[PDB]
Design a protein around this ligand. Structure first.
Ligand SMILES: [Zn+2]
Ligand SMILES: [Zn+2]
Lengths: 98, 1073, 60, 98, 49, 98
């Protein structure tokens, strides 16, 4: 061999194997074989807010800096109606206390 | 300020006294004898730029080529005895007695320069490798040492040509001659060159003196030459028993570098001056205060390169203002230098005792809390030193175009004053004296609105909005858009409601000091460097009428005393009214308007000094400055004609080309404000006296003498030369590789190169900058103000915009350039002689030739070369795919026209296709090139090459070279192209089969000099005699000397002139008294 | 170390010297009246700013 | 067959002026610098500035206007063809709204 | 800041750089498994309803 | 440009042709996967960012801005100056351009 790869073939394959990863499976709020939901017993809006904060912390940890530039929480816009899927509700519409 | 502290030290060596601190100790000792960073580098560059090295000399011969042997001829043989050859007698032949001789390019190989310029092009003979010269520049990615990017050849070649020119810039020195005693010439003068070795040189320099014993090719040539053109044939001696000024000699020298040094000498001869006009220039810059003397006798042709042109002065001034835009830290020490240089000269001495001794005369009643005279004293504080504030205020008049000296915030009455107060009145007096000495265009309206701030609630004027009202602080009015309309149109100030703002506006519009002027310097020896004013003119904000007498004394007929008188009488009018301040006792009002009257009638000499003597001082300082004065015109009280900006350009904007059309929108505004205390300027205006019995011509004739004994000012002009030459050769060399706006020719289109981006142009410009800084011995910044933009489209211009929108611009026409003339000359002669620097033109053809013929591959027969418009030739290109064969059918390849074809015939590749498929084509093609009938013509324009020789008597195959080359071809680099070419023989030899693969297309064998070089003929090989077309001056009796056939041959032997001038310093020739 | 000209107090840094001289016009009775006026209105609760809540728990 | 971009794309061209006001982002930066120059110029909107800072302001705005940035050229030419190369290899293929 | 600053490498060739950057990312393509996954997804949606 | 050679055979089977109907329905299912969960969207976006960073020819350094702004060390000598103000505001010594 004589040619050196100018973008760097190991670096490009190291990046694209991380871009290759499939989508995360969000089963939360869906029944199991027994008939129960698979959530965390907390309501939908607080689950969405907690979840955006967790993903902001993950974005901060992913780069080597401690404080994240790009954020998902407290973005300066009001989003008090957003509610993401949790297991407080069932498929009927009632609650899943028991 | 106080300085002394509790120290650790004692024991004066006399008087045996030990005491408190060393700071008291050393004053105690002295009484015994008395009474008995980018910004800092820019600053240092402006204060003292590096002077360059123009005059560099060359004792020894003036060539740039050499004749190197390659393979030695057989001196013992069995067809001709050893007594035939002149090697058997150790006869020093003027040419290398070998078998194959080639000429290569070492930069001069022979010089005895006193100052070496670290810039050279050394080439190995073509049997060795010459690829680092062509991968030197910008192959930061090439893996293999033997490889180089073919898409980046032209930038390498242009840097090598610039490198070659920047070496060959010397002046040929006359050394010394000796009359011949040997009968080889007809008594011709020879040239003796210095050095420890001189034995080879009298045979290398003069090829036309040697014995001609036999019928060798050298002897055929030398006895075919013409005898009388040996050594000196002309000299110009102007003295008895001194060195001859210039001679003309015949010797070995190529017309290329002879013409390069001739153009460089014509440049310096344009630069030349003489001490009579040096005396005239220094006298009329002195204005008669300093007299120097030049000799009047037959000279010895001194060479002083100092006279330069107005265009170069203006271009250097534009580059320097472009350098010092928007910093002020590169500006402050220049004005400090001018202030201390003015303190060394100026005759007055500011004594604060005058104002105190005249204010101790006041008559107050002491049964009163309010003390106006003590308010004056405690407000002005005369007792401080350091009126360098006043000297910097005097120095900013030179440099208003980038410096706006404005009055500081801290000398203002703290958020509006009241006319009923006292210290606000004295605030207004300090400001009304100090504001006329600044270069701020808003000083009159700042004075008027200082008064309008000081009276609020007493008088009202109509302002133009509710943001900048009468209660708005006067310091915020520093823009001519913010001027009140009631100030200019004065009737809106009604004289019934507001009669004092009425009449103070009448004082401003009438008795404010008028601008005037004075002339300085000369444009004869050194050109005038100012560009928005006419040449040799200096602008002053106050009037200047020259003094009649030379023993100065008091009179009151000048504009500053008129101004102070008007200010004091209006303050008398302001203290007059009982309406504006009713709480005053009638005794105190009259008594201490008497103080205003006496302060009007104070005796001081600072106004007469500013009228009569300080402009003469600025006129005699201003030629002796590293930063020449840069001025915009002074306007007194005109909203139409104030300057609002000044801006320089360094690049064009768009497809638009003309700088007058691209200038109004592409600029960088330069300039910065400066703060000054009004208090120091006011007390320096109120107090100033002369030495008690002085005579001005004696005073200035002592003071101006050492700063004209200095001679720093002449060295900056050479720096201005090389700055202008560098920016011109930068845009000329960038125009070769990038599509720019300036009209240039280009001879190097046939060399393939990169589609160049702005980063490529910036990098190439950086390398050109580093080469020109390595030559000429410079270390500070050069072209770094112009590498911050795009080097492709560059221009140099400047403008300032008047308030109405009328712009006044200066586009200096770029002068001529010996450096770019020599670079274009070297490019054209390289276009005709490309083989000597290692380049071959055309392209190569890869195909098997198995024969016993002895034709050289650098000159192939035309039966073997095909091209595009040849029948039976497939031309490949964009659509190129390869289909595999199956069941014995031959595999095929896709034509550009959509056809299929087997691996047989004559093909044409671009080099990029082979590079993009460099390994997949190898496994498919290399088995068929070696044993089959496939032939490829890879078109590539230009390539370096190496030469491998072989005995024509033995077998020789080339696959172990060509396969290594084809394998080493990489998408980003290629190695040199190896050729296999036989060795010329003297006698009859046998014939052996030789198998050659890589052949050239057109003639590339120009670098060959001679074959077998000692034998009476050349049999069975490539044949070439001594090139008669080179040595034209010898072989043609009809051709006169000074006849160069330069753009097609270099001739290697011609007349060259040789100089014996001297370059003494200016102080060693012209001196004062 | 630098010193003052009134009261000859020696200090060390020049900014501290400026502060001391600034800590140092009209007649002596008038300076006494001004200083008594400012000392009277010095810590009066008309000049002071930025106070605190009281945790009232009365005044319903 | 289309990918909606928020800017204009041009054919890829290595040599073009880095100061080129045909470009959208370069034109945008130039006009924002010119309006802030017109805002500072007359000193109408800024009382209380006791110094004439207008010369230094217009100088530094001219310096920011005339800069060797290759990011607008890059976004004009080479970033859209890079997105067109990267787009149909994604695990979560793109979802655009006009 | 990323808009105001940024430069190309001083010897860029688009053909070299883009062939060398596009070759290993297409060598790690996986779109064919995504096509088969979309087949099974649509078949499962229809048999679900 | 790729190429793919092959021998003539009938029994070769590689099942890889879908239609736009399946390709759109699976896209709708993948959009319903997200459901305002911010960890579903984060690694896709960040990994595409890193892949563009490793492919992209454009390298970025703020030393262009630092060399154009010549004014250094002004913030404590004088209270205000615009070149030092915009230099300390842009903060060219950061290198996280995520
Ligand atoms: Zn003593
Ligand atoms: Zn004190």
């Amino acid at each position: 061999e004589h040619y050196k790869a100018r973008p760097g073939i190991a670096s490009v394959q190291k990046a694209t194997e991380s871009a290759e990863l499939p989508m995360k499976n969000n089963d939360e709020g869906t029944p199991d074989k027994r008939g129960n939901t698979k959530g965390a017993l907390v309501n939908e809006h607080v689950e969405a807010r907690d979840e955006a904060d967790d993903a902001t912390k993950k974005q901060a940890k992913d780069t080597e800096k401690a404080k994240a530039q790009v954020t998902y929480s407290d973005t300066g816009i009001n989003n008090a109606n957003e509610l993401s899927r949790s297991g407080n509700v069932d498929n009927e519409g009632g609650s899943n206390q028991k | 300020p106080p300085t002394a502290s509790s120290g650790h030290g004692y024991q004066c060596h006399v008087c045996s006294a030990v005491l408190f601190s060393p700071l008291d100790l050393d004053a105690h000792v002295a009484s015994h004898g008395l009474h008995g960073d980018v910004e800092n580098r820019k600053t240092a560059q402006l204060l003292h730029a590096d002077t360059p090295r123009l005059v560099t000399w060359d004792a020894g011969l003036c060539t740039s080529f050499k004749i190197v042997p390659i393979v030695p001829a057989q001196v013992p043989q069995d067809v001709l005895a050893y007594t035939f050859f002149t090697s058997s007698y150790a006869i020093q032949s003027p040419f290398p007695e070998a078998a194959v001789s080639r000429i290569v390019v070492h930069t001069r190989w022979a010089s005895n320069v006193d100052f070496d310029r670290d810039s050279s092009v050394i080439m190995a003979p073509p049997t060795e490798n010459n690829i680092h010269l062509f991968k030197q520049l910008l192959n930061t990615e090439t893996l293999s040492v033997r490889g180089a990017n073919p898409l980046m050849f032209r930038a390498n070649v242009l840097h090598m040509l610039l490198e070659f020119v920047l070496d060959n810039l010397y002046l040929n020195r006359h050394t010394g001659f000796s009359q011949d005693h040997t009968p080889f010439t007809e008594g011709a003068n020879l040239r003796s060159l210095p050095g420890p070795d001189a034995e080879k040189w009298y045979s290398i320099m003069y090829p036309t003196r040697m014995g001609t014993p036999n019928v060798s090719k050298i002897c055929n040539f030398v006895a075919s030459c013409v005898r009388n053109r040996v050594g000196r044939f002309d000299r110009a001696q102007m003295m008895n028993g001194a060195m001859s000024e210039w001679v003309d000699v015949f010797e070995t020298s190529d017309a290329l570098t002879v013409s390069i040094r001739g153009r460089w000498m014509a440049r310096l001869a344009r630069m030349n001056i003489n001490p009579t006009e040096i005396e005239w220039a220094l006298t009329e810059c002195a204005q008669g205060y300093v007299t120097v003397t030049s000799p009047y006798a037959p000279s010895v042709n001194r060479l002083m390169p100092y006279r330069i042109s107005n265009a170069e002065r203006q271009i250097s001034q534009i580059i320097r203002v472009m350098n010092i835009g928007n910093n002020a830290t590169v500006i402050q020490p220049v004005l400090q230098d001018i202030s201390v240089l003015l303190q060394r000269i100026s005759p007055l001495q500011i004594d604060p005792t005058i104002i105190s001794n005249t204010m101790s005369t006041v008559s107050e009643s002491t049964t009163q809390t309010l003390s106006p005279a003590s308010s004056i004293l405690g407000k002005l504080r005369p007792s401080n030193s350091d009126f360098s504030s006043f000297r910097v205020a005097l120095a900013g008049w030179l440099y208003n175009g980038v410096v706006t000296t404005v009055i500081d915030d801290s000398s203002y009455p703290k958020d509006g004053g009241s006319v009923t107060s006292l210290e606000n009145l004295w605030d207004f007096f300090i400001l009304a004296l100090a504001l006329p000495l600044t270069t701020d265009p808003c000083a009159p309206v700042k004075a008027f609105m200082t008064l309008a701030n000081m009276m609020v609630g007493f008088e009202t004027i109509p302002m133009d909005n509710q943001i900048y009202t009468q209660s708005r602080r006067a310091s915020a009015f520093s823009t001519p858009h913010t001027w009140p309309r009631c100030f200019m149109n004065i009737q809106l100030i009604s004289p019934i409601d507001a009669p004092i703002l009425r009449q103070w506006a009448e004082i401003i519009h009438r008795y404010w000091p008028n601008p005037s002027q004075i002339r300085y310097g000369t444009p004869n020896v050194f050109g005038s460097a100012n560009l928005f004013t006419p040449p040799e003119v200096l602008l002053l904000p106050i009037d200047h009428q020259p003094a009649n007498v030379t023993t100065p004394t008091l009179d009151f007929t000048n504009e500053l005393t008129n101004w102070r008188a008007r200010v004091c009488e209006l303050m008398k009018n302001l203290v007059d009214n009982q309406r504006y301040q009713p709480g005053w006792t009638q005794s105190l009002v009259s008594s201490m308007r008497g103080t205003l009257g006496k302060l009007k009638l104070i005796k001081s000499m600072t106004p007469m000094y500013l009228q009569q003597l300080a402009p003469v001082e600025l006129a005699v300082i201003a030629p002796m400055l590293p930063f020449p004065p840069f001025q915009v015109p002074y306007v007194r009280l005109d909203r139409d004609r104030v300057p609002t900006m000044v801006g320089v350009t360094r690049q064009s904007r768009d497809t638009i080309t003309q700088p007058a059309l691209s200038l109004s929108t592409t600029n960088t505004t330069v300039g910065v404000p400066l703060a000054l205390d009004a208090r120091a300027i006011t007390v320096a205006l109120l107090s100033g006296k002369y030495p008690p019995d002085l005579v001005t011509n004696v005073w200035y004739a002592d003071a101006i003498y050492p700063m004209y004994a200095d001679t720093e000012v002449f060295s900056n002009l050479q720096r201005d030369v090389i700055t202008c030459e560098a920016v011109q050769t930068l845009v000329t060399l960038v125009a070769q590789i990038s599509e720019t706006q300036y009209p240039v020719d280009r001879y190097l289109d046939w060399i393939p190169s990169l589609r160049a981006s702005a980063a490529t142009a910036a990098t190439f410009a950086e390398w050109v900058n580093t080469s020109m800084k390595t030559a000429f011995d410079l270390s500070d910044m050069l072209l770094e103000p112009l590498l911050s933009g795009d080097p492709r489209m560059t221009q140099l211009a400047i403008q300032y915009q008047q308030y109405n929108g009328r712009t006044f611009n200066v586009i200096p026409e770029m002068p001529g350039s010996v450096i770019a003339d020599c670079v274009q000359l070297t490019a054209e002669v390289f276009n005709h002689e490309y083989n000597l620097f290692g380049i071959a033109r055309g392209d190569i053809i890869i195909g098997r030739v198995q024969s016993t013929h002895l034709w050289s591959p650098l000159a192939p027969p035309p039966d073997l070369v095909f091209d595009r418009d040849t029948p039976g030739v497939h031309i490949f290109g964009r659509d190129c795919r390869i289909s595999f064969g199956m069941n014995g059918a031959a595999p095929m390849i896709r034509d550009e026209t959509g056809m299929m074809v087997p691996f047989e015939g004559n093909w044409i590749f671009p080099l990029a296709l082979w590079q993009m498929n460099t390994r997949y084509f190898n496994q498919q093609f290399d088995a068929w090139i070696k044993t089959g009938e496939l032939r490829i013509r890879i078109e590539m324009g230009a390539y370096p090459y190496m030469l491998h020789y072989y005995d024509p008597r033995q077998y020789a195959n080339a696959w172990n070279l060509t396969s290594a080359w084809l394998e080493e071809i990489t998408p980003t680099s290629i190695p040199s192209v190896p050729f296999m070419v036989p060795i010329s023989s003297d006698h009859d030899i046998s014939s052996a089969p030789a198998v050659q693969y890589i052949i050239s297309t057109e003639y590339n064998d120009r670098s060959l000099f001679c074959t077998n070089s000692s034998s009476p003929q050349t049999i069975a090989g490539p044949d070439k005699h001594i090139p008669v077309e080179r040595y034209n001056i010898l072989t043609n009796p009809d051709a006169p000397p000074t006849q160069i056939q330069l753009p097609e041959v270099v001739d290697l032997y011609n007349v060259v002139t040789r100089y014996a001038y001297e370059t003494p310093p200016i102080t060693a020739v012209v001196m004062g008294v | 170390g630098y010193q003052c000209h009134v009261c000859s107090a020696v200090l060390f840094s020049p900014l501290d010297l400026d502060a001391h001289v600034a800590s140092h016009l009209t007649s002596s009775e008038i300076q006494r009246h001004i200083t008594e006026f400012i000392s009277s209105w010095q810590n009066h609760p008309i000049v002071q700013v930025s106070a605190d809540v009281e945790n009232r728990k009365t005044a319903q």
